[PDB]
Ligand binder design. Structure first.
Ligand SMILES: Nc1ncnc2c1ncn2[C@@H]1O[C@H](COP(=O)(O)O)[C@@H](O)[C@H]1O
Ligand SMILES: Nc1ncnc2c1ncn2[C@@H]1O[C@H](COP(=O)(O)O)[C@@H](O)[C@H]1O
Ligand SMILES: [Cl-]
Ligand SMILES: [Cl-]
Ligand SMILES: [Mg+2]
Ligand SMILES: [Mg+2]
Ligand SMILES: [Mg+2]
Lengths: 359, 359
């Protein structure tokens, strides 16, 4: 048990599509800031906590499945829900947390410390800390700007360095003090623009599915990624005004290295897409979705790749990633976007280890 | 027991927010077409079937709750799911129907006849049959045009008389033969434009919530219904092209009387809204939303009207209904919109009683 020799906490990412339990061990430096953070246990379950019926039977079963086979107990737990919970009013969220609090009070293996919904701005701060902790860019002053994107199921986050600015909402700026260095970040989360929520606006768009895919309305797919991308861009920009919010800020505060986490790592690592060095460009992502999925015959393609439950969505998702990054954020189609390998189980929860405060 | 002397079937509306069981008795005319349709049992449950975990324990608890206390069971059952289920790919929908079929086979009473997902176009035909059945406009040729809107949680339907147009998809037209008359209808369903799915694009729009309502992002509501409406219109028209699809048809095929079912009946019948004769105008809907919700201080208003779970959403919903009907469908803001009183339990299921065929 590493936790007899190191500090350990458990942090649960209660995401829109599923929850991920992590147990982390760590030591601390002379200011009591964590270092040597190691994941010693992981467990993921589906579906999203905020999608299940909020009654005792259902919540008991879900929590029991998530937690019950961990090799290490008697450790503090931080349960933090994200955009799936944010879709619900406080009073519905309350049903979940009252039931959760009760389940923890009824047992003795886990010590619940916090269980609450964090804002997309909190989540975006944690997204940047987690990635930059793994890149070891936190201990010393960097001479390059690292931006992070988290491609979630219900919201997407963007976060990048930006000097403190009297003209931008205080909620979209964070002054972070860590390892003796002062870091100022712009943060934004776009609720409804995560892959599940976005997709619900395009399921009858023939351009967004392979040829002959059966759309729910009875029409047929007729895929064309640039056309699908244009439809998604309408939601990005005509509805959410992503471009007007984010592009002027990126123009003034350029990002040298972009890192992405969330669903895009899984798409880019699938059998259908081909990228080297765990990185992509939006130009290649759109090309590959267009020709590998959109313009293919659905039943033939589905028969060739039977084991991928996301296959039917790849025309829409490649198009959507491009719409978000290129037409929303203004990122050049030729710019490299690194993505963290899925095997790494990297989500924003490392950020909670390093930084316990919330908005 | 009515069912000893009259034909009875059970029809379940498995909607996105809940399921409604109806047992209908009826007689038939000389062509075996139902007449004297009466609801003899109703039970409603939440949440929507396509929201719950598709496992044996969860599905059996949900079906038991919906069906077990029905006071007549040896009758044919039709279980028809709508837009909630259409958000999921066929492979996920199959997990639900496989479990549901198994549950029916573990009892000997209900004769399950069909359990399947119907298209939005089927649903729109049944919406028009159900309302016109109640208005007694089916047995004779009408000299006026009756249009129906169903304001659902995941999709909205619109349906109205229109002669065959060879330039419009076959999927959006139905040639209906009922009571010896031939009726040609235009049908359309807009997936993702139902109240629940729409709302997930505007939860951090301050214009769509009462003053100081706590938005999930940490910002404050600052309601203004015209402004909220314009945001929703961008989703109606810039994204879904509702205007371009519907207005040219209604221009050439005007509707004389509009009837609505779905959530708008509940909103219009609430304590916050004031309408006479079970009818509204969009101009009065928007003005009442603006003044009675959008421009009120949230804590004050919430304290005044504690018993209404939808109150927080009424600035958004009033603006949304106006965006859909006026800016999307092109209906004049002073045109009367009849809504069916909620206590009538009217949904599209009476259409299934009348017309068993699907597309
Ligand atoms: N092959 C894939 N393509 C796109 N998105 C994916 C894929 N696999 C998983 N996701 C999404 O990736 C996120 C993280 O998934 P997981 O680590 O499996 O919970 C969720 O939003 C999933 O819906
Ligand atoms: N007061 C209300 N305002 C707006 N929508 C409502 C209200 N009450 C119920 N609904 C919606 O009306 C539809 C039918 O509700 P029910 O008859 O309660 O299943 C669902 O989409 C509900 O979410
Ligand atoms: Cl549909
Ligand atoms: Cl948020
Ligand atoms: Mg996430
Ligand atoms: Mg059979
Ligand atoms: Mg419905």
């Amino acid at each position: 048990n590493p936790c007899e020799k190191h500090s350990c906490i458990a942090v649960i990412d209660a995401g829109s599509t599923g929850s991920r339990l992590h147990i982390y061990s760590y030591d601390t430096d002379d200011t009591n800031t964590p270092i040597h953070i190691e994941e010693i246990w992981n467990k993921k379950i589906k579906p999203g906590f905020a999608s299940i019926q909020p009654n005792s039977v259902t919540i008991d079963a879900y929590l029991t499945m998530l937690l019950a086979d961990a090799p290490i107990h008697n450790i503090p737990v931080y349960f933090y829900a994200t955009a799936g919970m944010r879709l619900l009013p406080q009073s519905q969220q309350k049903k979940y947390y009252d039931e959760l609090d009760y389940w923890f009070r009824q047992q003795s293996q886990w010590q619940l410390v916090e269980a609450k919904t964090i804002t997309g701005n909190d989540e975006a701060l944690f997204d940047w800390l987690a990635v930059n902790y793994k890149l070891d860019t936190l201990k010393s002053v960097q001479n390059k700007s690292v931006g992070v994107m988290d491609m979630g199921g219900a919201s997407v986050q963007i976060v990048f360095p930006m000097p403190k600015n009297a003209e931008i909402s205080k909620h979209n700026q964070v002054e972070l003090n860590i390892y003796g260095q002062n870091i100022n970040l712009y943060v934004h989360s776009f609720l409804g623009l995560g892959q599940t929520e976005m997709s619900h606006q395009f399921l009858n768009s023939p351009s967004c599915f392979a040829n002959d895919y059966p759309l729910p309305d009875g029409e047929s797919g007729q895929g064309n990624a640039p056309s699908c991308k244009e439809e998604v861009t309408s939601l990005m920009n005509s509805v959410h005004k992503v471009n007007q919010q984010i592009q002027p800020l990126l123009a003034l505060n350029p990002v040298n290295e972009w890192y992405s986490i969330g669903g895009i790592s899984n798409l880019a690592s699938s059998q259908l897409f081909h990228f080297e060095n765990s990185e992509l460009t939006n130009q290649s992502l759109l090309q590959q979705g267009d020709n590998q999925i959109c313009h293919q015959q659905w039943d033939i393609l589905n028969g060739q790749y039977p084991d991928d439950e996301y296959l039917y969505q790849y025309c829409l998702l490649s198009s959507y990633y491009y719409a978000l990054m290129v037409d929303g954020y203004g990122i050049n189609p030729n710019q490299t976007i690194h993505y963290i390998p899925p095997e790494q189980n990297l989500d924003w929860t490392i950020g909670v280890v390093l930084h316990r405060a919330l908005e």
